[PDB]
Amino acid sequence: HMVPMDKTLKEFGADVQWDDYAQLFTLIKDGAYVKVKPGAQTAIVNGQPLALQVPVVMKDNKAWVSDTFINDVFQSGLDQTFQVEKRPHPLNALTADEIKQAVEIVKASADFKPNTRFTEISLLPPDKEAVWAFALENKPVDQPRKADVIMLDGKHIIEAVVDLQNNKLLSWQPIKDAHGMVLLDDFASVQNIINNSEEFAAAVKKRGITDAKKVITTPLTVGYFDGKDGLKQDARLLKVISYLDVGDGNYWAHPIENLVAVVDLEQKKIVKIEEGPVVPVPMTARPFDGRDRVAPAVKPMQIIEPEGKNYTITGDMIHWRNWDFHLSMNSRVGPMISTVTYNDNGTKRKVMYEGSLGGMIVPYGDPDIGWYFKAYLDSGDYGMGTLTSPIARGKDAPSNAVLLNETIADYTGVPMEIPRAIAVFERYAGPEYKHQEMGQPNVSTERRELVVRWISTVGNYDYIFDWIFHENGTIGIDAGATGIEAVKGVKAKTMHDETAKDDTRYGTLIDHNIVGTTHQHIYNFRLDLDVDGENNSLVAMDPVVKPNTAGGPRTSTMQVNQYNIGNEQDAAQKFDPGTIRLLSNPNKENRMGNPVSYQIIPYAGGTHPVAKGAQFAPDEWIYHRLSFMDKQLWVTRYHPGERFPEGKYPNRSTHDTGLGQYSKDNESLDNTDAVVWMTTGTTHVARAEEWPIMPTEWVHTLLKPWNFFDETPTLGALKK
Amino acid sequence: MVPMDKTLKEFGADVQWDDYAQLFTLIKDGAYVKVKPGAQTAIVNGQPLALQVPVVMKDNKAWVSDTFINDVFQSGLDQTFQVEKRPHPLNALTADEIKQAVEIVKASADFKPNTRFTEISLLPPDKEAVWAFALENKPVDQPRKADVIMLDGKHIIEAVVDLQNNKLLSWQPIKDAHGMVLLDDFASVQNIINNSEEFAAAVKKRGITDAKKVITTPLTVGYFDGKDGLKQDARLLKVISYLDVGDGNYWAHPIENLVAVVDLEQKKIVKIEEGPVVPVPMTARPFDGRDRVAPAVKPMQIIEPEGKNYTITGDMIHWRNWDFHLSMNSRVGPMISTVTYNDNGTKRKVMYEGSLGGMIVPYGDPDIGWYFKAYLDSGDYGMGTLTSPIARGKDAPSNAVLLNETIADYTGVPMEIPRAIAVFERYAGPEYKHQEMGQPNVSTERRELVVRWISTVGNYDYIFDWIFHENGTIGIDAGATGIEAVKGVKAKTMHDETAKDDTRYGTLIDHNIVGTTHQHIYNFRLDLDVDGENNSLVAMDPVVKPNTAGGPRTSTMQVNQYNIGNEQDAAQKFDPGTIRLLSNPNKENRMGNPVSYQIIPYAGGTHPVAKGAQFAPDEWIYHRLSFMDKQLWVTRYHPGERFPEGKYPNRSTHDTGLGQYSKDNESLDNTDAVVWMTTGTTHVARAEEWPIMPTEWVHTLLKPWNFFDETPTLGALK
């Protein structure tokens, strides 16, 4: 029998286009670009003919297809974008079965508990050398597949390691003084607790709210304040900031200011309620989904690749032009780009062994009761991988993108497949190079970039990360921010009201009775670059103006001060965009005798004002707990266990267990395996243009080959 | 009948044949046509068109009526271009006006026989009247006038002509002003050198067996208060030479330490400076691919089958909420004028005029052949004149519309530059997004309208993009590519004896070739009128202040706001961590905040950033060009102050540009301000940039700040 074509294809997630003049359907879905005419015995898939067992049938202006059409067409093989992996890559993320296997192993332990949740279940990384050998030499990794299983028993963290190959538990280590990240069920627990609190209902009522059932809570981490916040360090707590649901789909626009409830999770009870001055809840409807807006007419624009893509995805490995890399998903930091090599005329040269988001922080600058503790570590305390937002096909990524599904474990240890978790797409990026010699034929070539995009939403903020592989060897990493701002309810409607000045001391008045509290967005990327090998050195090149000592009219010259940065301590520094910092390989040179290197650029621009460091006095704890905030460049000795800038267990941490810890011994960085950490951020002073919803703002970082090659990388294959 | 593919391609249209669909897809600029052989109708931008003669297949060769292109492409179904019934007052001089102006000055008894024209451009009507035309359709009751700047030998004369009444209004010789370099000067230099026995003698001394293979370059000499031993009153140019080896890239073969000084009026070398002899790098280094084979790539197309979202009426461009005027100038290229943002039905002023102000590419090597090297490409060579036609689909995306522009050449004859400017819309990620947990997603795509212009002066190719974002933001990017200026050296690798000395002022990017360090400094003149003429410059510096409200916090994040009341204070370095606004103290948004635009001189770049001029304050280039050392300048609107480097920068003895425009330190309080943004890079070369440099970009931004009352892209309320 058959089924309606449009409905079915839309359900399938394919774009359906009908050309009445040509009597032709054009179907697009990831790497598949299809053309089919009603009644035709064949269809075209990426330029190749495909025989259909059932032609598309047109009835009374309605098209119908066989129930096997989607499978026969989209899984024909003529779409070669995806290929089957014959030999499993050692860095492949844990499969659904493996996740379940790990969960069974720990549950076989006599110590496992019923309320035991899983903060993270991820592959235990085999030794770096074995992995590189596999990627380059194709040598098998004779080491057993293992998995780290981090459990949360009540409020206690337990680190267990399971041997998946031999289905046996290898370790069970409780981690004292460590708090666990926030889990999904905590979100519902908070709302439930507030709903059952007689006092809170009373607190809310005196603040103008009649129906407490319309109150929406949010689970915020409290941080650490040596007790000044009056909170027992031992307990698993969360502060609750509330909003009123007015039915406009945007409760963020209706803050219940000066009301904070402290909740003890294991005790499932409100242990404290801080109250400040009563501020009337901003009530005006402020929808952002367009319900109250007119839809402007816009002409269609399509980016198409009718014969398929230039990249191939074998398993989790992506091949594109001279690039080869592995892409996997982690519940905490999201995407991980591994074993990155650049094919130099037949020879695959190492570039980066492992790269990913290190961690990030969004600290606010308002001292009041509902803001002073607010300093989010989104990936660390909330798991950005877990909170991945599926790509909106054609909107969050260009129409010519390919969308990948990714699987991770949820907090209960059950496999979870995130649909459209990552977008991959090639894009035109202007001319690669050009030269119009006067009176001569022009010379131009277009530039192409391969983008790997991932979006994660943690509450009100929506973050976008793009890993950009330039055909010329350059690698870019951009971070975009959008979503809804965290606002403060105030009494002033305009800057002319009496309280305006005081209401706007820590933020801009972006709407009536609404202030966009000033804050920063500080991102950090962990980049284990192995420039043409593991042993590298950090070199500095500072352009300077020195007195002319060669005679002639000039009083000055442009020269460069070059020196090595031999230790981690000296490598942790602010970044001057006017200087040059290289991660060189002192063991290999290019054709001119220069060490093959990559230029590290932590700050390549941004659309919001740039964060020169953490906007905190040096005597604030957040500044103390988190040191990665103040430096834009860090370089440490390779260590498989050092992966997070804010530390492994940042929730209510008492001291820096991250980059401050990784570089505290000030080890040598001379001709050894280095790991680069780039920190880049923005300072956000709000404006009306960003409310009710904020246009995407971006920050850019860059990694450029510096004498890594012997000439223009994109000139092409040498004819003679 | 006539062959389709042959005719269509001569027309410049792209032809695609789909055998499965038996359909031809024809594309050219805003027209997207679909036609099947034998069909009595065709489709143009989604609309049906009746054909007089169907397309016919003859021996697998399609044929069309001899009137096909006109009937289809000029049908009217492609609405990209609309007729301009009332000419915009800022329209550039037409070919007829260029010839009229030349006839007017040539009729004067003072016009000498071989006089050339450095520039022939529209003399701008008063701003007020122009705004009234754009906002009120009010006619400009002032005759079209043209500035005619002549070069009589080496003497500059400024004339003004009344085009409407066809009469000469003024004729003023400009004392001590040197004229820019003109095209014929390039040939003179080469011919003068070619006929120089002494030069040929010097060249032989340096290993060149055939002097006829020597390629010259016309370089401005600057000013060094005589220390360079050059006569200030003479029209001079220094000549740096290269050896043509037949690889199509003479730039890769420098004849180091050989500099000839040519007096253009005497037409002869008046000085030859010789330094140590360095063997000419000989290895062929073509950049045009003659020795390469590109990897096969799958096709990519960006299509708009229903036409464009923008309309071009004459030179007026309408797109979404934006409306602006695009014109061409021989010196600075494109000019963006009368820019307004249609705020829910009401057009609000944003920028009266915007364009490249000027730029300079100064080097940091003290040696004989480099110390004077400081290029003012627009000012001294005329970048609009040297516009490089856009290579369709490569220099600009496949969905772009390419515009032709007309200017006058140095002999006063109209010159049409094909594909001089590219206009194209592009996807730029999501405009905004919010995925509320467990709720339906909300995402809208971002669209940007780009106006791209490319100019090439010698070895460098410069790209400029004026980017209009739907949300009111305006971006201005500058890209650099082309061939690097290199110094011939003895070292082949860094292991050679002279390596250290050879690389003191630049990187060794090839054997015996050093890419001398230099900077790229661009300056943009932006006459912003934020929702009106009268504005004020306001600073907002984010600062950390002690907490005085109580609680655990010791510090807070506050802003230090203050006005910058005068030109001298407005001339400043830009801290990308601070905020600088051009506000309209007379208008506010719904929250009582002054409608403003955020000025961002530095929004990013792919090359190291230039914090200022890499020159000691006692260097003459530094004294002559103050604009290089500050990223932000704000001056009072004046019709005759348009160039950061001054009107006549060739061998100038002092700053007649921004240094002069602000020397007076006038008030910037609630008045007509003009913003000048200086953004630059410091270029330290690498092997990856040779023989041809992959495009490097710098970015600037102008963002609406409380100009609107909410997210500008949400749309009108139902």
Ligand SMILES: O=CCc1ccccc1
């Ligand atoms: O995103 C940071 C903490 C948070 C989590 C959930 C809702 C609001 C805020």
Ligand SMILES: O=CCc1ccccc1
């Ligand atoms: O671009 C600056 C001066 C110049 C002009 C012509 C050829 C080479 C260099």
Ligand SMILES: [NH3+]CCc1ccccc1
């Ligand atoms: N007075 C305008 C200049 C002009 C000259 C000749 C034809 C058309 C226009």
Ligand SMILES: [Ca+2]
């Ligand atoms: Ca260490």
Ligand SMILES: [Ca+2]
């Ligand atoms: Ca490394």
Ligand SMILES: [Ca+2]
């Ligand atoms: Ca002035």
Ligand SMILES: [Ca+2]
């Ligand atoms: Ca102005």
Ligand SMILES: [Cu+2]
């Ligand atoms: Cu923000």
Ligand SMILES: [Cu+2]
């Ligand atoms: Cu350069």
